[PDB]
Amino acid sequence: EDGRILKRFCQCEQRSLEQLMKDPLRPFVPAYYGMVLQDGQTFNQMEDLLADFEGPSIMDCKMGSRTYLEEELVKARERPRPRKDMYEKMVAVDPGAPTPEEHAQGAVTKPRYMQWRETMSSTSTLGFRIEGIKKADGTCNTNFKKTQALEQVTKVLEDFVDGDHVILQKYVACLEELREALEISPFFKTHEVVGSSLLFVHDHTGLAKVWMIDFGKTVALPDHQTLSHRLPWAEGNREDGYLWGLDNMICLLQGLAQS
Numbered sequence: 001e002d003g004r005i006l007k008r009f010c011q012c013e014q015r016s017l018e019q020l021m022k023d024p025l026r027p028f029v030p031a032y033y034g035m036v037l038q039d040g041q042t043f044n045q046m047e048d049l050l051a052d053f054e055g056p057s058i059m060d061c062k063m064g065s066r067t068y069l070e071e072e073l074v075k076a077r078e079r080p081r082p083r084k085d086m087y088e089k090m091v092a093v094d095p096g097a098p099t100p101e102e103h104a105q106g107a108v109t110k111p112r113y114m115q116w117r118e119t120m121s122s123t124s125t126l127g128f129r130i131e132g133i134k135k136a137d138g139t140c141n142t143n144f145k146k147t148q149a150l151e152q153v154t155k156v157l158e159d160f161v162d163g164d165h166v167i168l169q170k171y172v173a174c175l176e177e178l179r180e181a182l183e184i185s186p187f188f189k190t191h192e193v194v195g196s197s198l199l200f201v202h203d204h205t206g207l208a209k210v211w212m213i214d215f216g217k218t219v220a221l222p223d224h225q226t227l228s229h230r231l232p233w234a235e236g237n238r239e240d241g242y243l244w245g246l247d248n249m250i251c252l253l254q255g256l257a258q259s
């Protein structure tokens with residue numbers, strides 16, 4: 001559309017957006033405009049987050065210690081469904097990361113793949129991981145499958161803010177105010193948030209912002225029930241590591257800001 005973007009419909013994201021529009025997180029999420037049909041498909045219509053920017057830099061971090069839903073792991077034993085998809089996306093990073101049985105099948109299960117991807121990157125050590133970068137100069141990078149150690153992550157962050165400090169201060173101020181809103185938010189408090197990202201965008205005019213995006217697997221907990229989002233995940237507990245991720249992120253960016 002026009003200052004608007006169409007995203008492939010899914011129910012879970014619809015229901016999350018319509019709730020978030022009424023939540024203290026509203027300022028930190030893309031405006032939600034409703035749905036539409038076009039060229040044979042159904043779409044959620046969304047705010048174009050880039051609208052206000054001139055030649056933006058852009059970074060997307062997946063947030064959390066766990067990236068798959070629990071009924072993926074408890075449904076991976078009852079009726080297992082191995083994927084060609086994921087074996088290849090795995091072998092294209094580490095061959096012989098597969099097991100001699102996974103080898104002969106050309107197939108890995110989802111929780112297995114998602115698990116391996118969590119340990120091969122910063123997710124299991126920091127509770128967040130860089131997924132994507134596009135810089136002011138036209139270059140970009142989505143190859144972060146082995147970005148794991150604290151010093152690899154900080155190098156990428158350094159290159160992205162590109163010595164602008166200013167812009168880096170602005171981003172810690174966004175993340176710090178995000179965190180105050182997450183802590184008092186009924187939506188966050190009553191949802192499992194897995195697979196979602198923080199989108200960092202900024203300009204040579206010094207404009208900077210962070211949004212929460214991707215609510216395709218943000219799930220409602222049963223009545224009155226809450227998460228700390230800090231406590232470590234164990235099958236049954238539904239913990240996220242979302243706020244563990246955020247705390248670590250804020251800490252590291254402040255560390256850059258001293259520098």
Ligand SMILES: O=P(O)(O)O[C@@H]1[C@H](O)[C@H](O)[C@@H](OP(=O)(O)O)[C@H](OP(=O)(O)O)[C@H]1O
Binds near residue numbers: 067089117194216
């Ligand atoms: O980043 P990678 O290594 O390419 O892995 C994909 C990525 O983790 C997506 O976020 C995930 O969708 P969800 O997080 O929404 O599950 C998807 O699952 P899919 O292929 O089964 O959709 C993975 O293939």
